[PDB]
Amino acid sequence: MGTIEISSPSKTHILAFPFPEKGHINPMLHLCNRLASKGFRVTLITTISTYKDVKNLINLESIPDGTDKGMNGYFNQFKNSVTESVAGIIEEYKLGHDFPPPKVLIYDSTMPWMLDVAHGHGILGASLFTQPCCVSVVYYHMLQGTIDFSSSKVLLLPCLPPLEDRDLPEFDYFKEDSGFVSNLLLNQFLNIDKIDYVLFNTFEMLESEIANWMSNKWKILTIGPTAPTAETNTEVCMKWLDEREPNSVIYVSFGSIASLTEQQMEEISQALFTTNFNFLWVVREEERTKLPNCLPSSESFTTAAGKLGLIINWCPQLDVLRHESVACFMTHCGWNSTLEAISSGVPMICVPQWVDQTTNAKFIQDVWKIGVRVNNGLVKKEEIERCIKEVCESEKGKELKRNAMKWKDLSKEAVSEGGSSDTNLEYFASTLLFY
Ligand SMILES: C[C@]12CC[C@H](O[C@H]3O[C@H](CO)[C@@H](O)[C@H](O)[C@H]3O)C[C@H]1CC[C@@H]1[C@@H]2CC[C@]2(C)[C@@H](C3=CC(=O)OC3)CC[C@]12O
Ligand SMILES: O=c1ccn([C@@H]2O[C@H](COP(=O)(O)OP(=O)(O)O)[C@@H](O)[C@H]2O)c(=O)[nH]1
Known part of the structure; x- marks a missing residue:
């Protein structure tokens, strides 16, 4: 005599919130389909303007674009608005009766403050990096000031090939905005030690050395490609x-x-x-x-x-x-x-x-x-x-x-059964169910 509780994917609610740009929306969306294919309830949160394009199973929620029509003013307004409206959505679902309350927010890694929204509302936070391991590590090293970024320069970073100047991520193109763009990418790491799941849209064999290097600092989960294996117009x-x-x-x-x-x-x-x-x-x-x-x-x-x-x-x-x-x-x-x-x-x-x-x-x-x-x-x-x-x-x-x-x-091979990406995504989903 007694009672049994089962944690299955169908009773687990995953929120996803990408940065509103196609190279961030697209890989999030593929990952939401894969997660839905695994039985979870997945809600994709997205700005009202992207909502349309996107809009053409997976739950879909819209939020205000939160941005008057320069890079910086646009971003601070954006940070401010989507901080509030996503926090509101989380609370909406915690009281809802239809869906299960949300267990985890998957947020684009360029919005590290969403870890505070998630934690500050008592749910897990998963950062989706939408760029490979090799360039992300460069951003981390620039963040750390691990090195100095009539002569040419070559940079030697652990587990990376020598990088010429031309091989470095290009921020100077943005001129007076180079500081904002550069800040945006390095700040992906401000709270890396605190993120519950660190997801990378890449596969292990493609970036073996640097992926293992980051795995010994952070339990990163390489889970790509998120797109399926074998749109307008x-x-x-x-x-x-x-x-x-x-x-x-x-x-x-x-x-x-x-x-x-x-x-x-x-x-x-x-x-x-x-x-x-x-x-x-x-x-x-x-x-x-x-x-x-x-x-x-x-x-x-x-x-x-x-x-x-x-x-x-x-x-x-x-x-x-x-x-x-x-x-x-x-x-x-x-x-x-x-x-x-x-x-x-x-x-x-x-x-x-x-x-x-x-x-x-x-x-x-x-x-x-x-x-x-x-x-x-x-x-x-x-x-x-x-x-x-x-x-x-x-x-x-x-x-x-x-x-x-x-x-x-x-x-x-990576995203098929027993693939390194299939393993990591299953580690994500299985632990989501743990008591
Ligand atoms: C900084 C910004 C964000 C990242 C965007 O695209 C990247 O996506 C992939 C990562 O998954 C990479 O693989 C791609 O190579 C890379 O292009 C593009 C960059 C650069 C352009 C700016 C975005 C962030 C929004 C931004 C500030 C918008 C804006 C312009 C403006 O004057 O006010 C707002 C529009 C693009 C933008 O300039
Ligand atoms: O005619 C096109 C051109 C691009 N894309 C998609 O848009 C994304 C572009 O992302 P990417 O990281 O390659 O560059 P970005 O657009 O962010 O600079 C990719 O998923 C492409 O497949 C597309 O669907 N149709």
């Missing part, structure tokens, strides 16, 4: 790709924020309109006016080489990357783009722009050996064409593609 892009030859398309995307200069846009244009390959070039709506005048939701071309090109304002990038028609990825090397390509086996042309893109480029070409970085800071048509020849028209290109298929298989 899906049907359009797949139709066009379905009708191209295999291994014939150069996929070109510079992410969701970066915006190249008129001159740089022209360098790329001339390289792609004269190359021996088809091309699918994402050019965001707001960026379209920076195109060469010689060229609206999409545009179809016959290139001067007699090939075919499609300019479009947004695509399902993951599905493009996994289409047999894609030869290579010309990318700005944001970490989501880099990891999606890794998990798809697509070799890469690296045109890094700022923050962690420069360091990702370093690793893509020199550590993982799955792509080439362009040399500058304007990048000339001729330099783009050299890199296309390297990656798509050369025996080197062929080894690069082999390298990428090896990393893709390792990536699929």
Whole structure:
């Protein structure tokens, strides 16, 4: 005689709150699906403006965007507003009757003060880093002042390859804002010893040495890629790709924020309109006016080489990357783009722009050996064409593609049963249930 209590995922309530930007929303969202696939109740909290895009099982809550229409004023208003409204949501659910009360807030690692919201409301806090281990450690070392950041400089950090100046995360691009952006990334570590779960969207084999190094300081859980293994304009892009030859398309995307200069846009244009390959070039709506005048939701071309090109304002990038028609990825090397390509086996042309893109480029070409970085800071048509020849028209290109298929298989192994990422995510979920 007596009573039994069962803690299952279905009675455990996970809150998620990403920073409102696609390279932060996207990997959170994938992780919420995986967690829901594991039976938990998952509520994704998101700003009202991102709510729409996102809105197109997983619970969805909206909060006020909390930001009048510079980087700094926007951020302090944001910090202030979302601190209040997320704290309010947590309390809403603690009294609710439908859902279970929340056990843990997963928050983007660029909002470390959300650990205080979570703890200060008596729930666990899980920090999701949306960048690899190797660049995150650089931010930590800059935070610590572990080293000094007519001569060139090379930095030697434990468990990392030598880093040239150009290999460091690029903050100076932001000029008077470099201090804010740099602060934002280093402050990911202000309370690292206090975070209940430290999650990294990466997989162990990709960053063995530095991941183990961070594991001996912090019980970090590498859990990526969060995206599934084998979006606006899906049907359009797949139709066009379905009708191209295999291994014939150069996929070109510079992410969701970066915006190249008129001159740089022209360098790329001339390289792609004269190359021996088809091309699918994402050019965001707001960026379209920076195109060469010689060229609206999409545009179809016959290139001067007699090939075919499609300019479009947004695509399902993951599905493009996994289409047999894609030869290579010309990318700005944001970490989501880099990891999606890794998990798809697509070799890469690296045109890094700022923050962690420069360091990702370093690793893509020199550590993982799955792509080439362009040399500058304007990048000339001729330099783009050299890199296309390297990656798509050369025996080197062929080894690069082999390298990428090896990393893709390792990536699929990591998130499959008994994979290192599958283990870590199961460690997250199982301990969530513990008394
Ligand atoms: C600092 C900021 C936040 C990070 C954003 O993107 C990153 O996402 C990935 C991490 O998961 C990386 O892999 C990507 O390489 C990286 O691009 C972009 C950077 C830089 C731009 C600024 C955001 C934070 C918001 C920001 C301040 C917004 C803003 C502009 C302004 O004048 O007031 C507000 C818009 C972008 C922004 O400048
Ligand atoms: O046409 C596009 C271009 C980009 N993306 C997605 O937007 C994210 C971009 O994140 P990333 O870290 O690569 O760079 P950021 O945009 O933050 O600078 C990735 O998940 C891409 O797959 C997309 O869905 N469609």
